[PDB]
Structure 1
Amino acid sequence: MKIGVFDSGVGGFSVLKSLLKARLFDEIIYYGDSARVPYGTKDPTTIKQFGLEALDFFKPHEIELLIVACNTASALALEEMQKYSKIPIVGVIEPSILAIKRQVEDKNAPILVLGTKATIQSNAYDNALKQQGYLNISHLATSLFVPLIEESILEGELLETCMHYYFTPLEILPEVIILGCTHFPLIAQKIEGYFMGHFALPTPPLLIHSGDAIVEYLQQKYALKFPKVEFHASGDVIWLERQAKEWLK
């Protein structure tokens, strides 16, 4: 069972981490479009075309399944890629909606979606959630989290000031926070720390992680069976691969 994983860059390693721990696949071809990252600050037309070009990369690798680890590509390009692909394509949004259906029974629970500008602007999460009957959805583009995390700024004053900048205007205290971006799991503890410490909460809000959600879904569709992993990039492949160890820690 040979599969491909597509991301705009290194963020997809957060999904790869979950896929490796699932012992579901024999071979994984990871491709990050690191020459053109980020996607989330760009426009739907551009991102759709990026997604179609990603299918071109995987043709010669004869994969049986393509995972779109990128939340931005999942939000803007997945439907377009599915129309032009003969093989199945799974993105990271729809499996997250199923995880919310299992873990969040109160349809009035305040849910906060965090993502790139493009992910939030698409309303992909809001639309899917509303389709399942959720009525209390807020969304917030937290663009600068992405470059901060890529510089390894995972704690301290800069992160906290950035976190305050985005979260201060919040009118509803969330019970659920969707980490609708590959990078955000790396600051999950800091995000929950912010809400406990600024809203005097007993426990933290519940965080939904895209990689864990897609694993749950994939396991419902594939038998249980350390896979072989290849790394490829449109920028320097060593600059990409050498960061894997730090993301898969």
Structure 2
Amino acid sequence: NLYFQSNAMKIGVFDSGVGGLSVLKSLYEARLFDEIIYYGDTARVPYGVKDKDTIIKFCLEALDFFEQFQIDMLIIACNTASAYALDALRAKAHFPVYGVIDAGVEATIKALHDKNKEILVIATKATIKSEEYQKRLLSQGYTNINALATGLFVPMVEEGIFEGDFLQSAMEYYFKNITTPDALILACTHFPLLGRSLSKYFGDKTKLIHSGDAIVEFLKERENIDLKNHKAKLHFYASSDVESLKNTAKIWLNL
């Protein structure tokens, strides 16, 4: 006879490239889903230095890619995509689509629970320029905020630079004459890879807000998700050299 997917929770995760694995890791370890389809646009990455129209266009193409999979919802792991493409994605999609920005703001408010505390948001140029984090935080009365583009962190992470003198110099470059924040929002998929180094740089007064952990808490509240028995079945796709993506995933997720 014939069986089709019954009660199985299958979702898509989209990112501009490999960075989004940091979000995949959180979703995977949280045991929320039975199956996850990851797609990274590695042929065209990065998005963070490009313009709104291009970013939106690329995301809508990604939505097209996913429509062959019958997913229950789509997570936009990419902070840059989350900053620009959500309206357009939702207008087209007939399943829920969630980005990581709202979640990250919510996580920051839970961590600080004091609108007077200092927040530093670090992200790509496009994300900062969107003013999405700034507007959300301001609308909640959190006005003690700095928003800084720390663009070089993206290719440094891709080159495997997670500590050392060169990374210290990049941190000094971006953070010179910056006040030490009470919370640092890692508003870019690549930035958790630098978390240990960022925390050492700023010291123990600074709480790091991880976008992947944030979206996990957000999803548990917004959707009806029972914890699953096993880890999800993972499928990886990429617009270029998918084997490299899988390799990085095996390392980052300890598969």
Equivalent residue for 1:118? 126
TM-score normalised by the chain length of structure 2: 0.93
TM-score normalised by the chain length of structure 1: 0.95
Structure 2 stretches of 5 or more lacking a match?
1-8
Aligned length: 242
Measured against aligned partners, the alpha-carbon deviations of 1:44-77 in whole angstroms (never above 9, x if no partner) come to 1110111111100000100010000000000011
**Partner Cα separation in structure 2 for residue 219 and residue 246 of structure 1:** 27
Equivalent residue for 1:224? 227
* Preserved CA contact (<8 Å) 1:192 1:204: no
Equivalent residue for 2:145? 137
Q: Specify the code of the residue in structure 2 equivalent to 1:60.
A: Q
Equivalent residue for 2:171? 163
Q: Specify the code of the residue in structure 1 equivalent to 2:232.
A: P
**Partner Cα separation in structure 2 for residue 23 and residue 80 of structure 1:** 29
Equivalent residue for 2:205? 204
Is 1:148 aligned with 2:156?
yes
Q: Specify the code of the residue in structure 2 equivalent to 1:182.
A: T
SS at match of 1:3: strand
**Partner Cα separation in structure 2 for residue 117 and residue 246 of structure 1:** 28
Offset of residue 189 of structure 1: 1.2
Offset of residue 223 of structure 1: 2.0
Equivalent residue for 2:5? none
Equivalent residue for 2:246? 241
Equivalent residue for 1:194? 201
**Partner Cα separation in structure 2 for residue 185 and residue 205 of structure 1:** 14
Identity %: 56
Aligned match of 2:180 in 173, 187, 203? Answer: 173
Structure 1 stretches of 5 or more lacking a match?
197-202
Offset of residue 98 of structure 1: 1.4
* Preserved CA contact (<8 Å) 2:76 2:99: yes
SS at match of 1:63: coil
